[PDB]
Amino acid sequence: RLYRADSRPPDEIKRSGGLMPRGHNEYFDRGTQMNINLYDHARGTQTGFVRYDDGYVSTSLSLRSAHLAGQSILSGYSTYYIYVIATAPNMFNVNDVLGVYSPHPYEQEVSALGGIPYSQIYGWYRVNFGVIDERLHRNREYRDRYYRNLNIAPAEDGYRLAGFPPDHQAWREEPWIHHAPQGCG
Amino acid sequence: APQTITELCSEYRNTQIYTINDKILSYTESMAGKREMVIITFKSGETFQVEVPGSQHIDSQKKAIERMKDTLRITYLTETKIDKLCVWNNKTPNSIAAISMKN
Amino acid sequence: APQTITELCSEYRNTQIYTINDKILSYTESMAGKREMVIITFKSGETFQVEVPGSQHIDSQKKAIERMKDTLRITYLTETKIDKLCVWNNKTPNSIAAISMKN
Amino acid sequence: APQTITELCSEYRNTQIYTINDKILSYTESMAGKREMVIITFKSGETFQVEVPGSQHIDSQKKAIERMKDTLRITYLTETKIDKLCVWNNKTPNSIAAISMKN
Amino acid sequence: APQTITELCSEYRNTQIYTINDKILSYTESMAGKREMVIITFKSGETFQVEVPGSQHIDSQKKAIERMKDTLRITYLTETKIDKLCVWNNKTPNSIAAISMKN
Amino acid sequence: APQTITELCSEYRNTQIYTINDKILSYTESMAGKREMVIITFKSGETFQVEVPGSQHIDSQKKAIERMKDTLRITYLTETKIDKLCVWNNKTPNSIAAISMKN
Amino acid sequence: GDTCNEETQNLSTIYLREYQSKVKRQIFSDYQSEVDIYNRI
């Protein structure tokens, strides 16, 4: 599973259909051509949030990395929640897709293209004054049989989606050459 | 006029309340001749069936046997928890007379 | 024709509105002979049924009674919120006449 | 045959196209004898009905009425927007003859 | 018996395959008398209908026409992409004979 | 009665159990006269049909062929994994007599 | 050129729309209620 600290409360995450990227009001809203570019996502910074811009929402591989991040971007918040999220093919491991060009290779993020739908949220912990209340609240709307087997999407599927600019050296070397869109390299 | 499955279940010859308090583990559906039944099982290892339509069943029961088979399919798919079952304990596997779900 | 549930409810004798505004707490379904019915309960303490079909029911109510039982299985299973019930209260449990959901 | 709802609606006398482009605010379903019907309203104030099977319906219309009620229930529970409604406007609430939704 | 939609569609006169590989863009449904039908349209500009049960329909087809409209409505709400359609090209809009979906 | 698909299948001549343990790859539905059937395939290459309601079918089998077709549409759109299939091996494609899903 | 970036957005959105349909196949399927075809026909 994957963890994301967010200041957005469960009922808001429900009202929106999930953990949404910056700008995207609710998950199935195709009423905003959202800019989606993994490379652009991976380099951004938003105050108040863990990377959730340019069409992807960022998550960490562990409750402590998720906490660590929470205490930097959300320090002094009275309350925020850490969301335990299931792996499914909408998730991309950023270091693998971006390779040696991963902006923050140490942060070891896994990004979800399009936001995390409420069905994929397994539950959440509540965090008060920086301290993790270790009682996990389960999301009863989670679809257990369906996420039970799924895993993250393979970087092969990610390579054509990396979003490096047309002139970025990456498009001309391995492995991205072999997956470069029309107009890249 | 029963307001509960134990109430309703106490009104027939040969029944038994079972507290399952679990989601269905497996679902089987047979379209095979003479055996048009649904057999479900639970991690308890307990098996029940919706019995074949047969001429003993009046028309109210025929419509009702089809509704129960529809309920056992979507309960299995939505992974909902069954609370209790009223079964006619006189055949194997025990026949579902009624089912109840909670929360 | 009536345009709301409180208006429809008012054309009948022995009816009343239960503002529920909550989701079904428990769902019981029976296919046992002469008791082929559905019973639903709410946190508030009330119990309601959908009646066995019989001869109090015009043929159109026999299709509509099966529909009401379909709707209550989906709203229970999905934890959908019921606004108001109109029920015939000269019955035990009270009997569902019409139902409404608001979004 | 017609290819669009606006073409289909116009072969009938006393019909009209409402454009809605919005989802159902509420669903009321009634099994009251002589009022077996679904009523739906939209936030704009508009209310429509799927009328009761009666003599104004050719025999083929009876299975279609039933399908319409299925559609209006699943549309309301999934919150899908309704593009347009072609309704019979000789009654209150205007009764649904056709529905279109687009994605 | 045919193993694929192209094998099956080849067994008929006046049919033709369409490889759609897209979701339905719009769904229209009518309970208007003599036009109880469904019309679906794609963003290619192609319009298709499931035809009214009629004179040229064997009675085994009449229950299959009803299933087709049910698959078409849930295929539309869930946005599932149709793979191919086998249609009858001697009707306007072309009429649906078989549908296939994959993945 | 049987308590298992391996055991229900065991009792018929020209049946075969298939362990599939995978979701259905494609679904094809036909309303073509005399080819009103469902064909499902799995990536492994296996193709199976639900038999066009033939002559030897008792009316309990009529309702059961119609129910099998339901289950396969919903299993296919939900991507639920089929555990085992009991089929008739003297028909092409092999013909489903029963299905089981586990967990 | 902006092509590299339009093609990225366009392949990305096709990857999102497909996923949104698997999700809808999951949740909307809870509302599907089967018809007794022998009854109404």
The domains located in chain A, with CATH, are 1-185 (3.90.210.10)
Cβ of residue G29 closer than 8 Å to a chain A Cβ: no
Contacts of C97 in chain D (CB under 8 A): 30-32
CA D91 to chain centre: 13
CB-count exposure of residue C99 (10 Å: 0-12, 13-18, 19+):
buried
Cα C61-C66-C70 angle, rounded to 5 deg: 140
Residue from F83, F68, F85, F75 nearest F8 by CA? F85
A174 labelled ligand-binding:
no
Q: Check which CATH number belongs to the domain holding G9 and give it.
A: 1.20.5.240
The helix or strand, by DSSP H or E, that contains position E72, with its residue range, turns out to be helix E59-77
Contact: chain D with chain B (3+ CB pairs below 8 Å) = no
Show the tokens assigned to D72: 């209006």
Contacts of G33 in chain C (CB under 8 A): 70, 73-74
Q: d(Cα F88, Cα F15) in Å, to the nearest integer? A: 4
Tell me phi and psi for residue D54, to 5 degrees: -160, -165
**Domain boundaries, position G3:** 1-41
In whole angstroms, how large is the CA radius of gyration of chain F?
A: 13
CB-count exposure of residue A140 (10 Å: 0-12, 13-18, 19+):
exposed
Residue from E78, E74, A134, E97 nearest G35 by CA? E74
Cα distances from G23 to residues A27, A120, A168, F91, in angstroms, run 11, 9, 34, 36
A14 labelled ligand-binding:
yes
Judge: G38–F66 Cβ closer than 8 Å, yes or no: yes
Contacts of G29 in chain B (CB under 8 A): 77
Tell me phi and psi for residue B99, to 5 degrees: -145, 150
| Cβ density class F50-66: b for 16+ within 10 Å, e for less | bbbbeeebeebbbbbbb
Q: Which amino acid is at B71?
A: T
Show the tokens assigned to A19: 């953990």
Q: d(Cα A132, Cα F33) in Å, to the nearest integer? A: 64
Give me the resolution in angstroms, 1 decimal.
2.6
Contact: chain F with chain E (3+ CB pairs below 8 Å) = yes
* β-pairing verdict for F94-102 and F26-30: unpaired
| Cβ density class E22-60: b for 16+ within 10 Å, e for less | ebbebbbbbbbbebbbbbbbbeeebbbbbbbbeeeeeee
A107 is catalytic: no
Q: Are A86 and A138 in contact (CB under 8 A)?
A: no
Q: Beta strands of chain B (E only): which ranges?
A: 15-23, 26-30, 38-41, 47-50, 81-88, 94-102
**Domain boundaries, position E51:** 1-103
Q: Check which CATH number belongs to the domain holding C3 and give it.
A: 2.40.50.110
Give chain G's domain count.
Answer: 1
Q: d(Cα F82, Cα F94) in Å, to the nearest integer? A: 16
Judge: C78–G30 Cβ closer than 8 Å, yes or no: yes
Cβ of residue C77 closer than 8 Å to a chain G Cβ: yes
Give chain E's domain count.
Answer: 1
CB-count exposure of residue C9 (10 Å: 0-12, 13-18, 19+):
buried
